[PDB]
């Protein structure tokens, strides 16, 4: 994975690539790494994919119940605190490395989270195998007082650096923009620079090519009347 | 222990199990019966780690006998095999798993059919016309693949079984001291005293 988080004037943006890998093999070419904790709190995960999902769904569930209990909109520090205490408890065995970002009544926030339970604060962050390629871009082009449009550009450029230069990262760019006083906009497949070219040949077979021994109807319906 | 074989013919199931028991470098016994009757028409042979085999078999036996008394009814071989599988699948993730492989030969009185189930210590169940555990299959399955028919008589099943034992006795480095053979059919369980 390559994932980034970038703060700007009136909010925060996160982005991610869309490749998932089983060693050197690409399992999914269009994976969704941008997860929702609450409507305006989104996280992006690297490391063990099942862990990033499970831990995100769990904290998102508890955040929702907390929000209902307190009659308040959830805060990013709450998600942060709940995540790190959960991860710390399992001593790195839950391999979830997350970038957590969001907007709440306190303002806009951007945190990184490691599997052992350590958290960091920043204006720009990167995680995953392509973090170094992405950080090179962020360190080159990031500045204070970015606009929304500049931050999305910087974020997607950082992901692209990972896509092209890191073998663990590839395919498309997903983005989520969280601006203060607005609904969060999830931009699934914001960029699509890796469309497979047309194949030279069609491998559609003649009907009857495959040898068959037996045929049978499968009863999927329930037991019938009469 | 080592070799346990099983074959399902037309109207019966035949189980052959070795007689040897070895401690250290000494063969302590050459007449050991590696089997337990679970019910009148269900027989289970077993092989695996020392001690665990008999303890597991007797534990299964007690549970099936308890069921029989409670319901005044004999469980089908399929039901017994599923119960045994679950116990082994439960066991493999325990603190100390029971290292036991079993064959369950039964005659289903409802369907009037013989049934042979092969279950390993992991809880891997398969219904088969003939089966074995450990290295036994490496020597015997080629013979069984060649000679086996589903309409075989009990006598033909025994002759094919003799050929399997003869091959084992020729090509195994291991002296397993012959086999005790038992037949499971509609009339129940009986032992072939001359083999």
């Amino acid at each position: 994975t390559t994932i980034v988080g970038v703060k700007f004037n009136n909010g925060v943006v996160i982005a991610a690539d869309t490749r998932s890998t089983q060693g050197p093999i690409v399992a999914d070419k269009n994976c969704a790494k941008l997860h929702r904790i609450s409507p305006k709190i989104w996280c992006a995960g690297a490391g063990t994919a099942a862990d990033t999902e499970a831990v995100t769904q769990l904290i998102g569930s508890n955040i929702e119940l907390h929000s209902l209990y307190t009659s308040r909109e959830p805060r990013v520090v709450s998600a942060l605190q709940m995540l790190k205490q959960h991860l710390f408890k399992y001593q790195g065995h839950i391999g979830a490395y997350l970038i957590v970002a969001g907007v709440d009544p306190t303002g806009s926030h951007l945190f990184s989270i490691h599997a052992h339970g350590s958290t960091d604060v920043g204006y720009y962050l990167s995680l995953g195998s392509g973090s170094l390629a992405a950080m090179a871009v962020l360190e080159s082009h990031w500045k204070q007082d970015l606009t929304k449009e500049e931050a999305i550009k910087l974020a997607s450029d950082a992901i692209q650096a990972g896509i092209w230069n890191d073998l663990g990262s590839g395919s498309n760019v997903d983005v989520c923009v969280m601006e203060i006083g607005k609904d969060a906009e999830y931009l699934r497949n914001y960029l699509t620079p890796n469309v497979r070219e047309e194949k030279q040949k069609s491998y559609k077979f003649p009907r009857g090519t495959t040898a068959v021994l037996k045929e049978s109807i499968v009863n999927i319906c329930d037991i019938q009347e009469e | 222990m080592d070799i346990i074989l099983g074959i399902r013919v037309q109207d019966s199931v035949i189980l052959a199990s070795s007689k040897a028991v070895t401690r250290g470098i000494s063969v302590l016994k050459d007449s050991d019966d590696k089997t337990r009757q679970l019910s009148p028409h269900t027989l289970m042979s077993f092989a695996g780690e020392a001690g665990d085999t008999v303890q597991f078999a007797e534990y299964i036996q007690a549970n099936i006998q308890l069921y029989s008394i409670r319901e005044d009814y004999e469980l089908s071989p399929q039901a017994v095999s599923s119960f045994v599988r679950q116990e082994l699948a439960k066991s493999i993730r325990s603190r100390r798993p029971y290292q036991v492989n079993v064959l369950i030969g039964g005659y289903d009185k409802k369907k009037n059919k013989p049934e042979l189930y092969q279950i390993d210590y992991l809880g891997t169940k398969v219904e088969l016309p003939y089966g074995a555990h450990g290295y036994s299959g490496f020597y015997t399955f080629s013979l069984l693949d060649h000679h086996y028919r589903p309409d075989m008589t009990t006598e033909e099943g025994l002759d094919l079984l003799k050929l399997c034992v003869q091959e084992l006795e020729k090509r195994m480095p291991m002296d397993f001291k012959g086999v005790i053979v038992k037949i499971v059919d509609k009339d129940g369980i009986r032992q072939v005293d001359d083999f």
């Binding site: - | 013979l143 060649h146 000679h147 028919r149 589903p150 091959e167």
Partner: protein, 211 residues
Amino acid sequence: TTTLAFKFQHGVIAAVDSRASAGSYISALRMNKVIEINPYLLGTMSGCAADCQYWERLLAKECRLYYLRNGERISVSAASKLLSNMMCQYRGMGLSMGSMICGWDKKGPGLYYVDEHGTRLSGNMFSTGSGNTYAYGVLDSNYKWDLSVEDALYLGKRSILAAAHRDAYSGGSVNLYHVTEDGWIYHGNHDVGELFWKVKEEEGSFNNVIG
């Protein structure tokens, strides 16, 4: 692999499979595991393919030089021993080579088993490789000295089939050879997929398998 070879009234049969593996991956479907050392000498191959090819082709060099120096074909016994002596030099260095040296010489038909330990065994019947146990089952129950060339060829063919079926690391095709006093005779490549269905129908065997 599965290989076998056996002596009988009309010479020696040699049968091998053709599969090659690299873990669970089938790297080759059709590899020649027999080497034609000379018109009256064959060598089967089981173990490391490189070791089998290099050393048995080096054996053929040494068997050829024997003929030039002595004006006479090398015996099966002497050829098998030259090979076993090569194995004894690289003793413990990690070679993996199980082979049967089959041929016809003055003493009649000859068959020797040789492995990487320097073992050299004379005998009427041998089988090597991951599927040798399956082949032995069919061989032991059906072998006679009084076999006809036709029935003997079928036995070695059927014995490999047995192994190819059960052993995951044996299959592809069957290569048959028949060694006579006029030399060896190649009896073709037989795809196991096709052979299996054919044998199932004609013989009635493999009843458990559906086709």
